[PDB]
Amino acid sequence: FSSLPSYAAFATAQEAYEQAVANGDSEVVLKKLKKSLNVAKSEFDRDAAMQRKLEKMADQAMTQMYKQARSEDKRAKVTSAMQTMLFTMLRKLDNDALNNIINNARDGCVPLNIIPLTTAAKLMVVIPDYNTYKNTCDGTTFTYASALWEIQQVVDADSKIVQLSEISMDNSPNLAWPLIVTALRAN
């Protein structure tokens, strides 16, 4: 703040006061060129104190709209994320089993709990111990929920592949023992 209109005015007032101080003539020398200086008081008070408020408010505004631009970009980002997720899960879904059960409904509505139960292609079973294994999915095919399933792969709690011969009553204490069975719907 030096290029203001009143820097020159206070400069010339104090310069004339300097000229008269090098002169030093009268009592009006003191009175005047302390009042040439005492007029250039409001200049350098308001012109250098209202210039000290507009700039702070300008900085406030600039920071605020920076914030708003960033918040406007993140919205578009999350919009794209949600859309991609929905359209991706859409393409494991539009089969003919779904339309078959939906068109058998009298008004269009069905319970949600019977859609994986009747249209899913893959089943996952979690077994706590061997006694439960014997009564649920022993063999290589079993029946659950009015259908026939065919086993592919068995893993354990460490995600390591077990073979169906190892699962026995005397080898049972050597296995990490939630086992997870994966089966496919038989046709």
């Binding site: 408020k53 507009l54 408010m57 300008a58 406030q60 505004a61 600039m62 605020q64 709209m65 920076y66 708003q68 631009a69 406007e72 970009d73």
Partner: protein
């Protein structure tokens, strides 16, 4: 929040009165918003007063008072003018280069697309401004056309015949093959699919795309798009390297490709060799022989519309196996030699409106002169190929600019490629024209065609000239003057063997009228590229600046390879062309 159009600097300000809402940096925005008819600027929030009931929206007057922007009559004391230092208030206030000479952008912004000069400046500037002018032009095109007469046909006359009603207060636009409408079927609530159809002389006869039966309640418009910003220039930067880059040398070729070998190398040895083509020199054969020369190349069939790739489809049955190609069509009745939507296949049959953005080796751009910079630059955005192939020539005819009002666009300014053959020359030369005999190809030489076209066969001796009488009378958009029709029928009786032709006329309504008296078919001059008959009929009917234009008639002069009759109310080409004259009845 991106680079401004004239400065490549991140800003947040947009001209409110523009059509594109372009980015303009602070000093650059000051320039444009004081120097034109753009009075508004929008930022992350719109710079408008917040006192209820204000609608004065200039640029200089507004005052910023904290969390608001005021006008001087709306202003509490704590404020600052939003316009000072010749610099509007917005983000990134410092690091903007600006520009002092922005009167070119200023004129583009104020260019209302009436004069030819509008097109001249729009085709004389630099790149992203080329894009801005192009998209403003197309946006103003759709503002132009959609707001005209409603095609509300309120009864049916007969089979393929209709009765017309149209919008009041707003006139009705042409009914020609250059002007294609689009149908919507009204039900008690809203509209349903009908499709695009054409209207002609009836009492309205429609040249429908396919069979339809519409009762009353229906009405039509010519639909459009909502054109978004582009991405890429009109062409790629050139190359002068040492290699045929990215492809494989040759073992086999057929000797009918003898004139093909010499120009295969130049298109692939450097970035692009822009092709000029006289009518029927073998260009498509060349554009098919490209894949014949190198069986391993990906070349992308493009055009103005599919009807020309349908030509490249017609000769695709001739040469290349059907197991390397796919014909893409958007979700219309065209030619389909192959299966649709198979992008990942070697041959890419499509048009500028069809192909998804991918990458390829060579793009065969067809019929360039009927394309403006926009549809020319779209494929430069979609397809970043290393080599280009521009089938076309500014020499034939340009795309229909409905805003051709004062002056006429010269082929210097049809697009950037169009003056490119006139600045650097055509990087293409094929001297063997199978089209015409010793009459026309020799004649089209001194016309505009570089004195490079010359005879292939000898004279067939019936391509004669007959300059006519001429009387003028117009009705709406063309003219019917059976004076120009009279000598056609009355001299045809001298040659009954003259029933193999098409009657073409610049006034497209003449073919609809003449067929009642004459019986030979119809054809539109500007959309007649590629199609030819052995014997053809025409009457110039006048030498104004629409048809007999020395570069622009020449589609229908190279029509005949056997016999013609050029009925001339004209001096433009009679003493300019090189044929013989007979007596008039």
């Amino acid at each position: 929040v991106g680079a401004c159009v004239l400065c490549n600097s991140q800003t947040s300000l947009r001209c409110g009165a523009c059509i594109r809402r372009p980015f303009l940096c602070c000093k650059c925005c000051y320039d444009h918003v004081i120097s034109t008819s753009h009075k508004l600027v929008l930022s992350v929030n719109p710079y408008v007063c917040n006192a209820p009931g204000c609608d004065v929206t200039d640029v200089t007057q507004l005052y910023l008072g904290g969390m608001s922007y005021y006008c001087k009559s709306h202003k509490p004391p704590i404020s600052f003018p939003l316009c000072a230092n010749g610099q509007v208030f917005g983000l990134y206030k410092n690091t903007c280069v600006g520009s002092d000479n922005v009167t070119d952008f200023n004129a583009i912004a104020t260019c209302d697309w009436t004069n030819a000069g509008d097109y001249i400046l729009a085709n004389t500037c630099t790149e992203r401004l080329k894009l801005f002018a192009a998209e403003t032009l197309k946006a103003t095109e759709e503002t132009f056309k959609l707001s005209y007469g409603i095609a509300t046909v309120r009864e049916v006359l007969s089979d393929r015949e209709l009765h017309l009603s149209w919008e009041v207060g707003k006139p009705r636009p042409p009914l020609n093959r250059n002007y294609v409408f689009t149908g919507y079927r009204v039900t008690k609530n809203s509209k349903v699919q009908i499709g695009e159809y054409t209207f002609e002389k009836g009492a309205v006869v429609y040249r429908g795309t396919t069979t339809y039966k519409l009762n009353v309640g229906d009405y039509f418009v010519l639909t459009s798009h909502t054109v978004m910003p582009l991405s890429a220039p009109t062409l790629v930067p050139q190359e002068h390297y040492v290699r045929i880059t990215g492809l494989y040398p040759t073992l086999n070729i057929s000797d009918e490709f003898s004139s093909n070998v010499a120009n295969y190398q130049k298109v692939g040895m450097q970035k692009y060799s822009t092709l000029q083509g006289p009518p029927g020199t073998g260009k498509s054969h060349f554009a098919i022989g490209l894949a014949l020369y190198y069986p391993s190349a990906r070349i992308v069939y493009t055009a103005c519309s599919h009807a020309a790739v349908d030509a490249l489809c017609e000769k695709a049955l001739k040469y290349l196996p059907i197991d390397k190609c796919s014909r893409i069509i958007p979700a219309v009745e065209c030619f389909d030699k192959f299966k649709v939507n198979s992008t990942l296949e070697q041959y890419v049959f499509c048009t500028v409106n069809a192909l998804p953005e991918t990458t390829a080796d060579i793009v065969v751009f067809d019929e360039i002169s009927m394309a403006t910079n926009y549809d020319l630059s779209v494929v430069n955005a979609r397809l970043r190929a290393k080599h280009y192939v521009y089938i076309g020539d500014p020499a034939q005819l340009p795309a229909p600019r409905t805003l051709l009002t004062k002056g006429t666009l010269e082929p210097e300014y049809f697009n950037s490629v169009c003056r490119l053959m006139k600045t650097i020359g055509p990087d293409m030369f094929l001297g063997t024209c199978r089209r015409c005999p010793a009459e026309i190809v020799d004649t089209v030489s001194a016309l505009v065609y570089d004195n490079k076209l010359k005879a292939h066969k000898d004279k067939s001796a019936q391509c004669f000239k007959m300059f006519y009488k001429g009387v003028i009378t117009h009705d709406v958009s063309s003219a019917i003057n059976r004076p120009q029709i009279g000598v056609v029928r009355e001299f045809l009786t001298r040659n009954p063997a003259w029933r193999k032709a098409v009657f073409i006329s610049p006034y497209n309504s003449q073919n609809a009228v003449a067929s009642k008296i004459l019986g030979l078919p119809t054809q539109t001059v500007d959309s007649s590229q590629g199609s030819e008959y052995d014997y053809v009929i025409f009457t110039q009917t006048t030498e104004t600046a629409h048809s007999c234009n020395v570069n622009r008639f020449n589609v229908a002069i190279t029509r005949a390879k056997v016999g013609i009759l050029c009925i001339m109310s004209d001096r433009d080409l009679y003493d300019k062309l090189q044929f013989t004259s007979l007596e008039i009845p």
